[PDB]
Design a protein around this ligand. Structure first.
Ligand SMILES: C[As](C)(=O)[O-]
Ligand SMILES: [Zn+2]
Ligand SMILES: [Zn+2]
Ligand SMILES: [Zn+2]
Ligand SMILES: [Zn+2]
Lengths: 329, 329
């Protein structure tokens, strides 16, 4: 209602400041960082890379990130707490399930998954005492049966705690409509929900219609735009063919439609990525050397020069995330 | 050959004693026990159940078990160390990959996987310093391209270290001939390989030809039987429709063919199982209350009653596992 849980404990809403609402310290798999830290050079090297990256974002104005790495993205909340303390950047951790659930998760009922998401919000993650402040879910296509169980569990956990739900939309086909239908069938308010990766489409009438229904629209992959990398087969299905300015103009378009309050922006960046081909992190870092500072260093000035006023940009990067993250029923 | 790695440190061959070569403390998924221990009631409840069960096996003569839980079966070597020490039963831990590799494993090359298995054998598991003493691999059907990479990396790791390889197939499946092809193409000696779950069929021709090639034959699911549970589809799918006596008669058949030295016997038991339907452990515990003591309490007397000499049975339960586990380049 007024305090948000972070990996260093509770903070008040006013302390969050400029908040990147969809980021990762490391995109990995459950148990992997512990079992094979040398994949990333070392745990130390990954930690140090993340502390520099977060200090760079901080110098560019960022005060909070939301790490939307779930259990099955290899979330290590102890790593997050360490790099949060060393960078002096708040990190909100997530519960939920992404697209790589192991069997022990895939074979669970909606009731069982609700208890798991609830334990991570109400009690803590693992034995750390660190509580999730957001629930992350993911869909592909028209939403599979298991993904629908996960969305319903996420809705039920949200209804019991007030923490919001944020999604990974992996579809070339108005992928939020089915997510909205499932959330609404559960009695969840759209204002507790961010439909993420909404910048992957140019379908403005679709985005506007979700915003008018009260959903938050995550324009959160703005720098995933590889202009010149058609020699790499795997760099096209993880970056793209539309320019970053094209994606950023969706922000202006929704503002002009009257829905600035429904917009959340971010980079979807990370400092390590083992859940993809080897050396992918080198390709990503060469295409976007700004990392998580891309939003404040590139996108905010781009929008300013297009005529968006300062107060509107503050509304999007400070006010909207605060309203979204503060637990509410 | 050499001393054997256990979760309490190196032991000599002579200390292994009566060894069960395919067992589990808990069948789960990477990260799962630490993220959701109350799935098993609690971590402490699971540890206490394991210690009670191991102590009953110990009373019945068992001195060593080989826990062939891999990374992706949720191996928690600190759990293994706790219950080994409290039950005072040696436990050999495993590296390798089973049938639920996350993205961070299944997008790796054969060289990368070789390095991961080597790390777990030569350096230690996670940050524990506990080294694996066996490499566990698993296949479905034909052997998939990824599974074939896993088998080649396991062979290379075995060649570099002398530690043996042991395998899983699905219910009623064979698969040994397809696995042996790959292992021999890498130059691995059959004397370093156990073709596990070989009690899943009654194809004696298949079993005897692998044994004649020097493979170890794992007759290691002896108590698994859903006979009398025909209305429970999940129990039947898991435990199968063959009696424990049918499975045990394969031990006698291979002895009768002259292959006593190729035989390894076990229960493939566990004290928790989250990588299957909920409450399955209740079904399994009612089928086989003896747990891991099933082999010494029931199968050994069964085979004695069939006329097999005590010395042959001692060779199978003590000498064969010692020859198999002792690292041999
Ligand atoms: C954990 As099993 C029943 O696949 O050996
Ligand atoms: Zn995503
Ligand atoms: Zn993401
Ligand atoms: Zn198995
Ligand atoms: Zn097994």
């Amino acid at each position: 209602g007024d305090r948000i849980n972070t990996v260093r404990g509770p903070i008040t809403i006013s302390e969050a400041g400029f908040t990147l609402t969809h980021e990762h310290i490391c995109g990995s798999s459950a148990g992997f960082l512990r079992a094979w830290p040398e994949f990333f050079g070392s745990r130390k090297a990954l930690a140090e890379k993340a502390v520099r990256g977060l200090r760079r974002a901080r110098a560019a104005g960022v005060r909070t990130i939301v790490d939307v790495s779930t259990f099955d993205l290899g979330r290590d909340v102890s790593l997050l707490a360490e790099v949060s303390r060393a960078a002096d950047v708040h990190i909100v951790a997530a519960t939920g399930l992404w697209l790589d659930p192991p069997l022990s998760m895939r074979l669970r009922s909606v009731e069982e998954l609700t208890q798991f998401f609830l334990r991570e919000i109400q009690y803590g993650i693992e034995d750390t005492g660190i509580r999730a402040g957001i629930i992350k879910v993911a869909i592909t296509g028209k939403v599979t049966p298991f993904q629908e169980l996960v969305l319903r569990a996420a809705a039920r956990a949200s209804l019991a705690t007030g923490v919001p739900v944020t999604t990974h939309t992996a579809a070339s086909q108005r992928g939020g409509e089915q997510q909205a239908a499932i959330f609404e069938s559960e009695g969840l308010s759209p204002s507790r929900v961010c439909i993420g990766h909404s910048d992957e489409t140019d379908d403005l009438s679709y985005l506007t219609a979700l915003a008018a229904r009260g959903y938050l629209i995550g324009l959160d992959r703005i720098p995933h735009s590889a202009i010149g990398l058609e020699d790499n087969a795997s760099a096209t299905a993880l970056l793209g063919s539309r320019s970053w300015q094209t994606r950023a103009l969706l922000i202006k378009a929704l503002i002009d439609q009257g829905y600035m309050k429904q917009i959340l922006v971010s980079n979807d960046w990370l400092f390590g990525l083992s859940s993809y081909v080897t050396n992918i992190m080198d390709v990503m870092d060469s295409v976007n050397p700004d990392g998580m500072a891309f939003i404040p260093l590139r996108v905010i000035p781009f929008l300013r020069e297009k005529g968006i006023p300062q107060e509107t940009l503050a509304g999007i990067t400070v006010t909207n995330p605060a309203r979204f993250l503060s637990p509410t029923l």
